[PDB]
Each structure stands twice: as structure tokens, then as C-alpha cells.
Design a protein around this ligand. Structure first.
Ligand SMILES: O=C(/C=C(\O)C(=O)O)/C=C/c1cc(C(=O)c2cccc(F)c2)c[nH]1
Length: 356
């Protein structure tokens, strides 16, 4: 029996139902843009469960026994089986508000509120936004527009590996015992990504050393002329606080734009000779490295279902920093992701199987 939870499903990158899931992902994204959280969640769960199937849906009979497929979702699947297209997703793709929100938020520094503001001002293209003489842009948006073409082109694995080398070389200069791990989509086996994420931890660093590393590493890159953008968020995580029932609670992290020289990239394959890359660095205390790694590996849907399963099925509270057992009234310790899964009574799901 297919579980309703992504954390009890193996979801690999061989998606046999892209025709259905691309349409469901568009409809979910539109519901996010229309602030319809409930309809958004229903489409996300349906998309997720179809991504896990080991075969393609070719008839309505194939949907029997599959959870998270409500009547609205089954009408969409029926329409795609009919003529290979979703009329509903096609109408979203042609909607003026949807087109504008996708295009405007594709800029680094532009979220829902700024995209909505620009749309209500009558803007429809990035050229008209950038050349307007009345608009005021944040420092994040300025960087987003300046490096737009590089940031909108997919980061590939040779580029992610080139970035990993840069991160490791800079980090070990200040903390030689530090462990640097590439997380996110690339850890799940993806060929491309919009950014490259890293988790940094040190078994012997002090509380102060741990706090200063991201400042030292970014100052070093600034001196090197490689830091195109930098925003460091100080940690809000507390050693003895219960896990959330929240994006306001986090480890020390930074959102960066790095200058990646093409000479550093070892690929099979001209212009300026460098590429702007979005990089996120996360620093965590050594004892919480498994919780942080699990949280930063993703996918978004796998993380949501892990936390939901922990709460509803195990009466446990899971977060990027800890796992708390409400029945035993104790925090559960873990040195690996495997130990976290075992505490939750779940079979271990490999990172490449978390593409929910
Ligand atoms: O799959 C989803 C979302 C669904 O599950 C849903 O909305 O239902 C994307 C989640 C996601 C993206 C990332 C990255 O930041 C990332 C990407 C590439 C390389 C890299 F190093 C980091 C990690 N998790």
C-alpha cells in the first residue's frame, strides 16, 4: 500500500508521470501566487505521490489505491489522459498575473510582495522594470538584475564541484578540521540547480570560532574579488528550545553570489570567462550535523511529510536542529541521518530517493 507520506516513499529522478506532475506543479504554483494555501497543498501532495510511481499512468484504472488524489486532481489527470494536455495548466501558463509573477520572482531579491507591486503598477517585462527611473531597488535586487542572465542559466555538476573546491579551500584556511558537505538538489542526484548549498561543521571549533567562520570566509573572497553579493544571517537556534510545531528559527547562514572563473570548471566544454553562481553556506554545531544535513538535503515535500509524520504518527517534533519525543519527554541524539530515520521508526530513504 502506497503511503500518504513522502518520507515512506522512494522518489527517484526517473519520473514516469512528468505529463501529470508538470501540470500539477503549475497549478500548485498558481495557488501559491493566488494565496490559496489549501488548494496549493492538495496539488503538491498529488504531484509528489505520482513522482514516486514506478510506471506511467495511462488510464484512470491505474490511479486506483493511490492516496492524495482528490476529485479535483482526478479531473485534471482524466483531461491529460484524454488528449495529452492539461487545459487547466495551459490556461495558467497564458494568465497575465501568473506570467508576471514567474518572470518577476525569477530575479534574485524579488519575492511575492514586490512582484505583486510591479504587476499592479502595470509592469510586464524586466526591461521596463530595470529602465524605470522612479523605481527603487534593494541591494539584493540590484545584484539580481546585474547578474540575471548567469543566475537564470542552470548550475551544472562541474560548476557545483568547482564551487565545492572554492568553499573547501576557503573554509579549511580558517578551520582545517571542518567538514563541508554539498546539500540540496545536487546531493539528491540532480544534474542541475538554481544554486549550490553547503553544510559546514567542525568537531573542535569553539562557539566564537563557529560564529566567525562565515565572516572570515566571505572577507577572504571579498579580498580575492570573488564576492559579488553577501548577506549573513546570524543564528537564531537555541540549544535547549523544543523543535517548531517555522523559518524564523535557523542556523547561521549566508546567501551569496560568487564569481566562478571558467578555468576552475572541469567539464567536456568563450565570453567574459566567469559565471555568477548563487551559493548558500550553513554553519551548524557538530552535535546537530545530522538534523541539519537531513533538513538541508530536501526535497521541500520530503521535509514537510517527515515533520508531519513525526508529529501525527510518532508524537515527535522534528526540526533542522533537533528531534524531541513528547511521550518520553527527551531530545533524541543522532550522529547520522540513519539514526534519525530509526528514531522515527522509518526505513532509511537514501538522498537520491528523497526527490518527492
Ligand atoms: O522538490 C522541491 C520542492 C517540492 O518537493 C514541492 O514543492 O512540492 C525542490 C526542493 C529543493 C530545492 C533545493 C535546493 O536548494 C537546491 C537545488 C539544487 C542544488 C542544491 F545544492 C540545492 C533543495 N530542495
Amino acid at each position: 500500500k502506497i503511503s500518504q507520506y513522502a518520507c515512506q516513499r522512494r522518489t527517484t529522478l526517473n519520473n514516469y508521470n512528468q505529463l501529470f506532475t508538470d501540470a500539477l506543479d503549475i497549478l500548485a504554483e498558481n495557488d501559491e501566487l493566488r494565496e490559496n494555501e489549501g488548494s496549493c497543498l492538495a496539488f503538491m501532495r498529488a504531484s509528489s505521490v505520482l513522482k514516486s510511481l514506478p510506471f506511467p499512468i495511462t488510464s484512470m484504472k491505474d490511479t486506483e489505491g493511490i492516496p492524495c488524489l482528490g476529485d479535483k486532481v482526478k479531473s485534471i489527470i482524466e483531461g491529460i489522459i484524454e488528449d495529452g494536455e492539461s487545459s487547466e495548466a495551459k490556461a495558467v501558463l497564458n494568465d497575465e498575473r501568473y506570467k508576471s509573477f514567474k518572470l518577476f520572482t525569477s530575479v534574485f531579491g524579488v519575492g511575492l510582495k514586490t512582484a505583486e507591486k510591479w504587476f499592479r503598477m502595470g509592469f510586464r517585462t524586466l526591461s521596463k522594470i530595470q529602465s524605470d527611473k522612479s523605481l527603487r531597488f534593494t541591494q539584493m535586487q540590484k545584484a539580481g538584475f546585474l547578474y540575471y542572465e548567469d543566475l537564470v542559466s542552470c548550475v551544472n555538476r562541474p560548476e557545483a564541484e568547482a564551487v565545492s573546491m572554492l568553499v573547501k579551500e576557503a573554509v579549511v584556511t580558517f578551520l582545517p578540521d571542518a567538514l563541508v558537505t554539498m546539500t540540496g538538489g545536487f546531493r539528491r542526484g540532480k544534474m542541475t540547480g538554481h544554486d549550490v548549498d553547503f553544510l559546514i561543521t567542525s568537531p573542535e571549533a569553539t562557539e566564537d570560532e563557529e560564529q566567525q567562520l562565515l565572516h572570515k570566509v566571505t572577507d577572504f573572497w571579498k579580498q580575492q574579488g570573488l564576492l559579488l553579493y553577501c548577506d549573513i544571517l546570524e543564528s537564531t537556534f537555541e540549544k535547549f528550545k523544543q523543535p517548531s510545531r517555522d523559518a524564523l528559527d535557523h542556523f547561521q547562514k549566508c546567501f551569496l553570489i560568487l564569481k566562478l572563473d571558467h578555468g576552475r570548471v572541469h567539464s567536456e566544454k568563450e565570453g567574459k570567462g566567469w559565471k555568477a553562481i548563487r551559493v548558500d553556506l550553513v554553519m551548524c554545531p557538530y552535535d546537530r550535523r545530522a538534523f541539519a544535513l537531513l533538513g538541508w538535503t530536501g526535497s521541500r515535500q520530503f521535509e514537510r511529510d517527515l515533520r508531519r509524520y513525526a508529529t501525527h504518527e510518532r508524537k515527535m517534533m522534528l526540526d533542522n536542529h533537533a528531534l524531541y519525543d513528547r511521550t518520553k519527554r527527551v531530545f533524541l541524539e543522532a550522529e547520522s541521518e540513519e539514526e534519525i530515520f530509526a528514531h522515527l521508526g522509518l526505513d532509511y530513504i537514501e538522498p537520491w530517493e528523497r526527490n518527492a
